[PDB]
A paper describes a structure:
The Pden_5119 protein oxidizes NADH with oxygen under mediation by the bound flavin mononucleotide (FMN) and may be involved in the maintenance of the cellular redox pool. The findings so far indicate that the Pden_5119 protein shares functional properties with both flavin reductases, which use flavin as a dissociable cosubstrate, and flavoprotein oxidases, which contain flavin as a permanently bound cofactor. It follows a sequentially ordered mechanism where FMN binds before NADH and the binary complex enzyme-reduced flavin formed after the hydride transfer persists for a long enough time to be oxidized by molecular oxygen. Structural and kinetic data suggest that His-117 plays a role in the binding and positioning of the isoalloxazine ring of FMN, Lys-82 fixes the nicotinamide ring of NADH to support the proS-hydride transfer, and Arg-116 with its positive charge promotes the reaction between dioxygen and reduced flavin.
In order to understand the structural basis for Pden_5119 catalysis, single crystals of this enzyme were prepared and used to collect diffraction data (resolution range 48.75–3.1 Å). The monomer takes a flavodoxin-like fold with a central β sheet made up of five parallel strands in the order 21345 which is sandwiched between helices 1 and 5 on one side and helices 2, 3, and 4 on the other side. The oligomeric state in solution was analyzed by means of small-angle X-ray scattering (SAXS). Ab initio modeling using the SAXS data obtained at a protein concentration of 1.5 mg·mL−1 (73 μM in monomer) yielded an envelope that has space for the dimer. Therefore, we can conclude that the dimer represents the major species in the solution. Despite co-crystallization and soaking trials, we could not obtain crystals of Pden_5119 containing bound FMN. The FMN molecule position was therefore predicted by in silico docking analysis. Further inspection of the isoalloxazine environment implicated three amino acid residues, His-117, Lys-82, and Arg-116, as potentially involved in catalysis. The imidazole ring of His-117 is positioned to form a hydrogen bond with the N3 nitrogen of FMN similar to the case for homologous His-112 and His-116 residues in SsuE and EmoB.
Numbering used by the authors: 1 to 50, 56 to 148, 152 to 178, 190 to 193
The structure:
Amino acid sequence: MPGPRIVAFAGSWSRPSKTRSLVEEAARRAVARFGGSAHVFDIADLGPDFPQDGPHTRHLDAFLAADALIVASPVYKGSYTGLFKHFIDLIEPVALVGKPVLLAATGGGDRHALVIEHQLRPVFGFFEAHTLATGLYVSASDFGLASEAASTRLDRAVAQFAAHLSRHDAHHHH
């Protein structure tokens, strides 16, 4: 087990979205630090309110087996999207304990940046997941499309993955 298996999920269904560039520029820092062959999938390659033999090659089975998770959503209506939460509503309630999650979010401006603490961290603390100390809200300043002071926040948030894996990564029941 020399390399972690990373998955990526972005809650933007559109093809050339700015959320898919954020989740693609997340594993490369981990893959290039330590990892192999990240599963990066957009929510267009999903079963979005259609389990029954769908594209659960690229949603469910890669998500639950991953050693590291990066999760992202466009900020719609002061919170994440609905199609993002429909994917989360299908997870078993205790399925992601001991799992590192990196929170990310894209929006219109620099406003609405309490979605990391008040919207995404309560949902992934419901799963009792190892939420990292650095979630990152980005504005529409990116054109691995990135720009200033979000790249250093992203590179230093993936550095919090390998900092709880040292010496060869050392009433309810599922």
